């Protein structure tokens, strides 16, 4: 069995739960299934990466290219106005999510374009990531390691830059065979320099659309009917709209920003909310009782 | 330029090269391609695993099951006996690959089907391999390491047993995202019990078939025209078939059994031959230069 009142990880004040007797139950079924039935669907930025360190703000994959020694100060500035002006649409309390889709496209298409202009080549991505300031949440070792141990499919579904994400986890030594990454990848040129991006622009709001185009990968994992979903946004809540068959599913969500803003929303959608947190020990603990 | 006279690895008493100048340009072809244009295609048993150790010839994927503690000495007799027969044909200098062909299937059908009679639980393959005496060739943590850090694709094409192979490399901690395994994967029932095998059998003489039956993978790598191929038999020379276009390709073959009998057969078909050897330094040294 399982009890959250007895799990030291669920006693910190940065762990809110609306339906506690809901969590324990879902976790119990996750045990009955163990590894054989386990599946994990995860976002990357601010979920598997840190939102903040030593009090300082940590970078997203896109940022690693925004603060690299290849982009100009006028790009960062021009990119900054982009966020300043578009974040406001993202966090618009009245307009509904659908009435934003076109925006994200412009936001990205406009933020990537500045990188497509800076002439950034694959060659420097390994070098650049080699010294950036990114950080995987505390316990990134127990997480990826227990999963690879029990062959638990991990589907990282990110609206960031795939090539950067793949270089980060590779350097952290966790990019194992069980990890599948689906993100916005670069469509480089002849000199190994960036020239564009592949396919549809995956962004914070179309996860519903991105997930469905992968039913492919999902029907193949029929026996992995139990899934834990790690996300940091409402949009990440759709990251699993394409799983073949579902017996149990836990929605763990990080609320790293606008804290005194969306707490009730998170308690409703996600089963578990992690308010201002930089560790995976909680999910690593649920995996302990499960694997 | 490339000169094998100076690369120490090419000076060991386990390196027999028919024509080194041809071997030196090919390697030189690999070097002019770089990472972005390289991919690996290798057999597993006796290639990435050892032929013998401490004195006793190391086990193959199947051997790990054969001798498992879940297989009765009776199950082993029927299995071991089922080997003392077809092998006599498997290495019958009389017959040809065309004839020996239908024989193999029978052997594999008889071997697996027997293992199927023992009711092997997927959940226990970990302990089984965890105590077996399997040996990965010398210099592998690095082999898999240089390749994973460079993002190089590795296609392990094995006529052994899928799941067992995955566990051996997983425990050695080298089963990275860049490693793609294609083998004879077993299937389980309700309580995870070995019932049958997925897809079309892969045996020691028809890798050309499987090589074709993997378009998505290679089509996605139609750009990696430089290839290093590693095998332990003539049949492994076909492993690079599903390969769309090839600029440069280096084939390296290990000879661990019947040395005096087959030595000349391997020299006339493998650019670089590694006679009775348990290390990969000749290939790791090529990677050190190439990447």
CATH number at residue B242: 3.40.50.1000
Backbone angles phi, psi at A103, to 5 degrees: -60, -55
**Are residues B240 and B285 both part of a single domain?**
yes
Here the CATH number for the domain that contains residue B81 is 1.10.150.340
Q: Which residues of A touch B166 (CB under 8 A)?
A: 151, 177
Q: Which helix (H) or strand (E) holds A287?
A: helix A281-290
Are residues B108 and B140 located together in one domain of the fold? no
- A281 shares a domain with A233: yes
Number of compact structural domains in chain A: 2
Interface test with A, best of B124, B146, B154, B170 (most A CBs within 10 A): B170
Residue closest to B207 by CA, chosen among B230, B175, B176, B178: B230
- How many angstroms separate the CA atoms of B271 and B5, rounded? 16
- The crossing angle, in degrees rounded to 10, of helices A20-37 and A281-290 is 60
State the helix-helix crossing angle for B281-290 and B140-150, rounded to 10 degrees.
20
Residue A134 sits at φ, ψ, to 5 deg, of -75, 155
Closest-CA distance of chain A to residue B35, Å: 10
Strands of the sheet containing B179-182, edge to edge, are: B179-182, B154-157, B38-42, B226-231, B248-255, B272-275
H or E element, residue B66: helix B61-66
Task: Catalogue the active-site residues of A.
Answer: 43, 45
Determine phi and psi for A79, rounding to 5 degrees: -75, -35
Quote the domain boundaries for residue A232: 1-47+134-187+206-291
Residue in chain A lying closest to B189 (CA): A223
Which distant-in-sequence residues (6+ apart) come within 8 Å of B78 by Cβ?
A: B114
Q: CA of B107, closest CA in chain A: separation in Å?
A: 29
Rounded CA gap, A238 and A215, in Å? 13
Q: Look at the block and give the residue holding tokens 């060739």.
A: B137
Q: Quick one: how far is CA B65 from the chain centroid?
A: 17
- Whether residues B221 and B271 share a domain: the answer is yes
Question: Cα angle vertex A176, ends A170, A178, to 5°?
Answer: 140
Give me the phi and psi of B198, to 5 degrees please: -70, 145
SS3 (DSSP) at A27: helix
Query: Is B181:B190 a contact under the CB 8 Å cutoff?
Result: no
Among chain B residues, CA nearest to A181: B177
Question: Which residues of chain A neighbour B181 with C-beta distances below 8 Å?
Answer: 177
Residue A196 lies in a domain: no
How large is the angle between the packed helices B281-290 and B20-31, nearest 10 degrees? 50
Nearest to A280 by CA among A259, A252, A257: A252
Both A240 and A125 in one domain: the answer is: no
Size of interface A-B (CB pairs under 8 A): 34
B92 SS3 class? coil
Do the Cβ atoms of A250 and A230 come closer than 8 Å? no
Q: B210 with B249, same domain?
A: yes
What is the resolution in angstroms?
2.3
Q: For A175, which of B36, B166, B176 is closest by C-beta distance?
A: B176
On whether residue A54 sits in a domain, the answer given is no
Q: Are residues A140 and A265 in the same domain?
A: yes
Residue A195: inside a domain:
no
Looking at the structure, tell me whether residues A93 and A158 fall in a common domain. no
CA distances from residue B37 to B28, B34, B192, B226, B244 in whole angstroms, order as listed: 13, 6, 41, 5, 13
Rounded Cα distance, A256 and A279, in Å: 12
Contacts of B175 in chain A (CB under 8 A): 148, 176-177
Name the burial class of residue B1, with classes exposed (0-12), middle (13-18) and buried (19+) by CB atoms within 10 angstroms of its CB.
Answer: exposed
Mutation to test the A interface, candidates B147, B176, B291, most A Cβ within 10 Å: B176
**CB atoms closer than 10 angstroms to residue A260:** 6
- B198 falls within a domain: no
Using the beta-carbon criterion (under 8 Å), do A170 and B151 form an inter-chain contact? yes
Place of tokens 């150790």: B53
| Lookup: tokens for A244 | 């073949």
Query: Are both B80 and B35 inside the same structural domain?
Result: no
Residues A267, A289 share a domain: yes
Contacts of A34 in chain B (CB under 8 A): 123
* Separation of alpha carbons A43 and A182, rounded Å: 10
Task: Classify residue B192: in a domain, yes or no.
Answer: no
B121 has which bridge partners? B193
The answer to whether A194 and A188 are in contact (CB under 8 A) is yes
Judged by CB atoms closer than 8 Å, whether chains meet at A170 and B192 is answered as no
């Amino acid at each position: 069995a399982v009890h959250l009142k007895m799990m030291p990880e669920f006693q910190k004040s940065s762990v809110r739960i609306k339906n506690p007797t809901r969590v324990e139950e879902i976790i119990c079924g996750l045990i009955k299934g163990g590894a054989a039935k386990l599946q994990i669907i995860t976002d990357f930025d601010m979920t598997l990466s840190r939102f903040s360190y030593n009090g300082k703000r940590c970078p997203t994959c896109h940022n690693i290219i925004d603060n690299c020694k290849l982009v100009t100060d006028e790009c960062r500035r021009k990119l900054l106005q982009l966020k300043e002006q578009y974040y406001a649409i993202e966090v618009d309390p009245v307009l509904t999510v659908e009435e934003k889709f076109p925006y994200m496209v412009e936001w990205y298409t406009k933020s990537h374009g500045l990188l497509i202009e800076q002439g950034i080549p694959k060659a420097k991505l390994k070098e650049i990531v080699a010294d950036s300031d990114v950080m995987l949440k505390e316990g990134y070792e127990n997480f990826f390691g227990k999963l690879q141990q029990h062959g638990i499919p991990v589907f990282i579904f990110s609206a960031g830059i795939g090539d950067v994400l793949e270089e980060v986890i590779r350097q952290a030594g966790v990019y194992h065979s069980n990890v599948k990454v689906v993100s916005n990848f670069m469509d480089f040129d002849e000199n190994g320099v960036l020239k564009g991006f592949k396919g549809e622009l995956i962004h914070v709001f179309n996860k519903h659309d991105g997930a469905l185009k992968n039913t492919d990968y999902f029907s193949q994992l029929k026996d992995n009917s139990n899934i834990i979903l790690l996300g940091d946004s409402q949009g990440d809540l759709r990251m699993a709209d394409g799983v073949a068959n579902v017996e149990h599913i836990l929605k763990i969500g990080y609320l790293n920003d606008r804290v005194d803003e969306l707490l009730e929303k998170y308690m409703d959608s996600y089963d578990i909310v992690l308010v201002k947190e930089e560790s995976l020990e909680v999910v690593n603990s649920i995996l302990q009782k499960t694997l």
